[PDB]
Nucleic acid binder design. Structure first.
Ligand SMILES: [Zn+2]
Ligand SMILES: [Zn+2]
Lengths: 527, 527
DNA sequence: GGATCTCGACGCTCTCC
DNA sequence: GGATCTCGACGCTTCC
């Protein structure tokens, strides 16, 4: 059966739920699938929930814990994620406890007592997967509690870590199949944002589950404005453009700038600091003292903007982030979605602005070279950046394979422009003439060298007679080349050097389609 | 007495005058000083009229001719200027005639008869000064005509040719003093646009005149919009900027582009032709078949724009010229006014746009090297181009030294900006450090070489340690250097070479003011 | 002679969690 | 190894 059959407040516990939500959580209504998922679990069945980060996954097992006798067991990989939740629960007045590596002997003793203590009001217990695999004592207390009917529910946070596809895999997550083996009458809930069908199918196996429901929540964050701008070639002009946003539409408001590297973050920070902006830097190499200093001042609005690498992400819940700017594109849609989704967690209007620069492809391509589908994921991101008609949300839904309602909340929906299919085939033929000549000369072309030759610039040996670039601006040429790349008419060829991975372009796999002289390459342009 | 005493329709001829204006000339009212000058001449007194070209000087002696017995004599240096007039008079039904070098025996015979024929209705005769000095026959007919009271008025066009200061001097204009000597009761009128007090003071002697009235018309053309834009470094970008005007604000309308040289003119023409514009080139070297070809089609609106050197100017009277663009600056304020003054001769709104480019100073500077006060005139032009606050009309009036009312009809009057005095002294000290070094190295610096060094570019020998240019754009640096030049803190130095005169910059006469370490150089900037 | 071009040339910096 | 920098190389390019 489907979720719709569970969007119902028909159940013997619908009163107890609407009530706990409204008064214990102080929430007024259910977000999508939240009602449905609680019903399934209250119905004591197995369910997987796929829902964006910050979407409110936590509610869906914390609330059941409270509508039952005893506790709900919660499996969670990081101590910080657990501490995140318990603060919230302590503040709500809910009895929750967790256990650690560094947990106090007094605290462990008390927990053990509470689990079998029939009088315990402790309703949620958080533990790491190590505790399941490497504690005989804890397993025995769980067994006693299960037998005393005080233990009716299992929550597994971040269930994707089970799989060898799941880009956060953890060995200890493989032992967790023991739970439904030992506790078949304890219902299990699995939670994640990052769920491929074959990662869920595997977690379902690892955990020794069947049958199972799978509920997938939509990606959409309706208050978010999505825009892609051209990234300026000049780095000081790029800075000047930014300060004008922060001091114009975003004056006084909190926000984030995401950068490609740690150096990018340090440079841009300084640059903004000099121009008046209260900006702070966050990357992995940072002394963790400084990692914390920055979060504190930013969450407290002393700093207006954090300039950071992807290392700034885990456990960010600040609600009034009004803008997220991407100084460079992310490695993937999944990272972008995830990186930009930290904006507007107060559900009020917020801006998400990505600066697309040709050069950035190759810095990233080179970097994710060791990733199986690193390149494939990058090229998908580039194609987003290249799109000028399609609604930005329409493009995201294609990625999640979701049944795609924007209401002018992305740059392309606000355009009044028309479009048409421009035939750019000859530019490609022309560029392949250049590359063909280069190998006949045993010459390697960086993307820079190709463009120069096309423009009739660069080393004269690398130029091809009768090839004239059009009098289009450079950024248009960059877009035409990016196009052939991702279309694989061209391809990257990496070279590994003493210190760096660098990218070169070559005739790609699809160049043989041009053997058809009637072949047509078209690109959408404004009318 | 002054012109005001003559701005009056009190006279025995005024009724006849107003009537001839409206019903013969088809004109409704008098332009400034037109009334005053006619009155003086009708009263049989001597008057010099100084009035902008196209202001209507011709009316002021043609109309009296008709309000008098017999004919008015007109002295005119070019056959084209005479023919210009005669076409117009023929079109008005006025009996006018002229005499020439290539004049027919039949035509000469008939004229002599009309002059003494008491019944003649021939009211205007045009001749060259050659005719006065080198024709015994014509002078005798004049004498006979003067004695028969059929010859009451003398007009001398372009009276400035008399003087050794008037930049169109003609030797034959020195013989013309015989006229008031022989014909003291014929009144004389002198017309010119280009009149200095010492050119007037000289013509009054040559012509054997005293006393005399001098009426000076104001330069002002209330319908003209005056703007200075920055000229782009890229010449293809400069073309692109122009086409957007021509196809934008000036779509369908007639105009002129003025260029420094013939090559500039040929190039820009081709450049525009390729981009759809019906543009035509006019310079002195052109075969006169093509000189003529271009005027016909332009006047007939087949050509939208003439792209020309100063060679396109003498005898232009097209009324619906809606824009004049200066591709490069003129040699002098006097040339600019006159060149730009060809716009909007229908008195309806018209645009006058000058593209100021640093390099052009020196292209122009080098060429007028042989002119006494060429440079001084250029620097006056540069100082106009450099002004960002003052009303464009205010700056011009200072040049004609006239008692200066723009009504937002110049770019600077339309600005809402404020301004301030920026101290740029250290920049001068820094550039003088570079030049001192250059001469200590027996190196000559072109202006290009100076900027590069200042910018930390160019040949490394030519750079000075601890001299950092500011991070201002190049065009701003160009302006700072232009500023010191005309202020003579810097000066030009010309070198004569096989084929060309080239300019170098050197420390100028005013650099000794910086011996004062408290000395201050300031430049006006926007706030 | 000034000025754009082209060639080897020497000078730096070398990607996330 | 890829851009930037720096150099002498030869070839080309003043109104009415
Ligand atoms: Zn949209
Ligand atoms: Zn003004």
């Amino acid at each position: 059966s489907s979720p719709a059959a569970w969007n119902k407040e028909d159940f013997p516990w619908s009163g107890k739920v609407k009530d706990i939500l409204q008064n214990v959580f102080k929430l007024e209504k259910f977000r999508p699938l939240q009602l449905e998922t609680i019903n399934v679990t209250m119905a004591g069945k197995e369910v997987f929930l796929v829902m964006p980060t910050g979407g409110g996954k936590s509610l869906c097992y914390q609330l059941p814990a409270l509508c039952s006798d005893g506790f709900t067991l919660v499996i969670c990989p990081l101590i910080s994620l657990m501490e995140d939740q318990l603060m919230v629960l302590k503040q709500l007045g809910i009895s929750a406890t967790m256990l650690n590596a560094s947990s106090s002997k007094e605290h462990v003793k008390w927990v053990h007592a509470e689990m079998v203590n029939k009088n315990s009001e402790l309703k949620l217990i958080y533990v790491t997967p190590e505790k399941i695999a490497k504690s005989k004592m804890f397993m025995s207390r769980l067994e006693k509690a299960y037998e005393a009917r005080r233990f009716t529910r299992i929550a597994v946070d971040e269930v994707h870590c089970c799989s060898q596809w799941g880009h956060d895999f953890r060995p200890d997550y493989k032992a967790l199949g023991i739970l439904k083996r030992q506790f078949p009458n304890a219902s299990l809930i699995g939670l994640t944002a990052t769920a491929t069908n074959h990662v869920l199918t595997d977690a379902q196996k690892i955990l020794c589950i069947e049958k199972c429901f799978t509920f997938t929540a939509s990606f959409n964050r309706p208050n978010l404005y999505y825009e892609v701008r051209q990234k300026p070639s000049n780095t000081e002009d790029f800075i000047e453009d930014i300060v004008k946003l922060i001091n114009g539409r975003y004056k006084g408001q909190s926000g984030i700038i995401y950068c490609f590297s740690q150096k990018d973050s340090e440079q841009v920070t300084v640059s903004l600091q000099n121009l008046g902006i209260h900006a702070g830097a966050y990357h992995a190499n940072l002394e963790p003292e400084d990692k914390t200093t920055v979060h504190r001042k930013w969450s407290a609005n002393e700093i207006q903007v954090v300039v950071a690498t992807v290392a700034f992400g885990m456990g960010i819940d600040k609600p009034d982030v009004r803008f997220v700017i991407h100084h460079s594109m992310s490695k993937s849609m999944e990272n972008y979605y995830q990186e930009s989704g930290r904006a507007g967690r107060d559900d009020m209007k917020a801006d998400c602005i990505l600066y697309y620069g040709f050069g950035d492809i190759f810095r990233i391509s080179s970097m994710v070279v060791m990733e199986n589908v690193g390149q494939q994921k990058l090229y998908e991101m580039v194609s987003y950046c290249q799109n000028i008609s399609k609604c930005r949300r329409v493009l995201m839904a294609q990625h999640f394979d979701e049944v795609w309602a924007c209401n002018k909340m992305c740059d392309n929906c606000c355009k009044d422009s028309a479009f048409e299919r421009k035939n750019i085939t000859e530019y490609c033929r022309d560029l392949i003439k250049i590359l063909k000549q280069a190998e006949e000369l045993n010459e390697k072309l960086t993307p820079l060298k190709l463009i120069d030759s096309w423009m009739g610039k660069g080393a004269a040996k690398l130029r091809v007679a009768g090839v004239v670039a059009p009098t289009l601006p450079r950024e248009d040429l960059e877009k035409i080349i990016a196009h052939f790349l991702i279309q694989q008419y061209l391809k990257e060829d990496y070279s590994f050097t003493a210190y760096a991975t660098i990218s070169y372009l070559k005739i790609g796999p699809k160049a043989n389609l041009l053997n058809n002289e009637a072949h047509a390459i078209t690109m959408q342009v404004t009318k």
